[PDB]
Protein backbone atom coordinates (compact mmCIF):
# COMPACT_ATOMS: atom_id res chain seq x y z
CA UNK A 1 0.00 0.00 0.00
CA UNK A 2 2.86 2.52 0.37
CA UNK A 3 2.47 4.93 -2.54
CA UNK A 4 5.94 6.40 -1.92
CA UNK A 5 8.41 6.03 0.96
CA UNK A 6 8.79 9.79 1.15
CA UNK A 7 11.36 10.04 3.99
CA UNK A 8 11.26 13.80 3.40
CA UNK A 9 9.11 15.35 6.12
CA UNK A 10 10.87 18.54 7.20
CA UNK A 11 11.51 19.72 3.65
CA UNK A 12 15.23 20.35 4.21
CA UNK A 13 17.88 19.72 1.61
CA UNK A 14 20.53 17.08 2.29
CA UNK A 15 23.93 15.96 1.05
CA UNK A 16 22.52 13.19 -1.17
CA UNK A 17 20.19 15.65 -2.92
CA UNK A 18 22.76 18.48 -3.13
CA UNK A 19 26.07 16.72 -3.87
CA UNK A 20 25.54 17.12 -7.62
CA UNK A 21 26.67 20.69 -6.98
CA UNK A 22 29.73 19.54 -5.03
CA UNK A 23 30.69 17.51 -8.11
CA UNK A 24 31.08 20.82 -9.98
CA UNK A 25 33.58 22.10 -7.42
CA UNK A 26 35.40 18.76 -7.32
CA UNK A 27 35.72 18.88 -11.13
CA UNK A 28 37.06 22.42 -10.82
CA UNK A 29 39.64 21.32 -8.25
CA UNK A 30 40.65 18.40 -10.47
CA UNK A 31 41.06 20.44 -13.65
CA UNK A 32 42.83 23.39 -11.99
CA UNK A 33 45.24 21.05 -10.18
CA UNK A 34 45.97 19.18 -13.41
CA UNK A 35 46.60 22.50 -15.19
CA UNK A 36 49.05 23.46 -12.44
CA UNK A 37 50.75 20.04 -12.65
CA UNK A 38 51.06 20.14 -16.45
CA UNK A 39 52.44 23.69 -16.38
CA UNK A 40 54.96 22.67 -13.70
CA UNK A 41 55.98 19.63 -15.76
CA UNK A 42 56.27 21.64 -18.98
CA UNK A 43 58.56 24.04 -17.07
CA UNK A 44 61.05 21.17 -17.56
CA UNK A 45 60.86 21.66 -21.34
CA UNK A 46 59.75 25.21 -22.27
CA UNK A 47 63.23 26.66 -21.85
CA UNK A 48 61.66 29.69 -20.17
CA UNK A 49 59.41 30.09 -17.16
Amino acid sequence: YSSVDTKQKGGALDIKSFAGVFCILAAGIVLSCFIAMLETWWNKRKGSR
Partner: protein
Protein backbone atom coordinates in the same frame (compact mmCIF):
# COMPACT_ATOMS: atom_id res chain seq x y z
CA UNK B 1 -30.48 -0.20 40.77
CA UNK B 2 -27.33 0.82 38.96
CA UNK B 3 -27.09 4.26 37.41
CA UNK B 4 -23.84 5.86 36.20
CA UNK B 5 -21.89 6.36 32.97
CA UNK B 6 -22.35 2.62 32.39
CA UNK B 7 -22.18 1.17 28.87
CA UNK B 8 -24.21 -1.82 27.70
CA UNK B 9 -21.80 -4.64 26.84
CA UNK B 10 -22.59 -8.36 26.45
CA UNK B 11 -20.05 -9.45 29.08
CA UNK B 12 -21.79 -7.14 31.53
CA UNK B 13 -25.10 -8.42 30.15
CA UNK B 14 -24.08 -11.81 31.60
CA UNK B 15 -23.98 -10.30 35.11
CA UNK B 16 -26.58 -7.52 34.87
CA UNK B 17 -29.76 -6.79 32.92
CA UNK B 18 -29.65 -3.43 31.14
CA UNK B 19 -32.63 -1.36 30.12
CA UNK B 20 -32.83 0.11 26.64
CA UNK B 21 -30.02 2.60 26.10
CA UNK B 22 -30.98 6.23 26.75
CA UNK B 23 -27.84 7.84 25.26
CA UNK B 24 -25.48 7.15 22.36
CA UNK B 25 -21.74 6.70 22.96
CA UNK B 26 -18.92 8.03 20.79
CA UNK B 27 -15.16 8.55 20.89
CA UNK B 28 -14.10 12.20 20.85
CA UNK B 29 -10.97 14.32 20.53
CA UNK B 30 -10.02 17.37 22.60
CA UNK B 31 -7.49 19.80 21.13
CA UNK B 32 -6.06 23.20 22.01
CA UNK B 33 -6.60 25.83 19.32
CA UNK B 34 -3.69 25.57 16.92
CA UNK B 35 -0.58 27.75 17.08
CA UNK B 36 0.58 29.71 14.03
CA UNK B 37 3.90 31.25 15.12
CA UNK B 38 6.89 30.68 12.83
CA UNK B 39 9.76 28.73 14.40
CA UNK B 40 12.49 30.93 15.88
CA UNK B 41 15.04 28.95 13.81
CA UNK B 42 13.09 28.70 10.55
CA UNK B 43 15.90 30.99 9.35
CA UNK B 44 18.19 27.93 9.51
CA UNK B 45 15.62 25.24 8.64
CA UNK B 46 16.30 25.22 4.84
CA UNK B 47 19.46 23.14 5.38
CA UNK B 48 20.21 20.32 7.80
CA UNK B 49 23.04 20.92 10.28
Amino acid sequence: IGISALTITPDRENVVDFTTRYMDYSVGVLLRRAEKTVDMFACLAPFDL
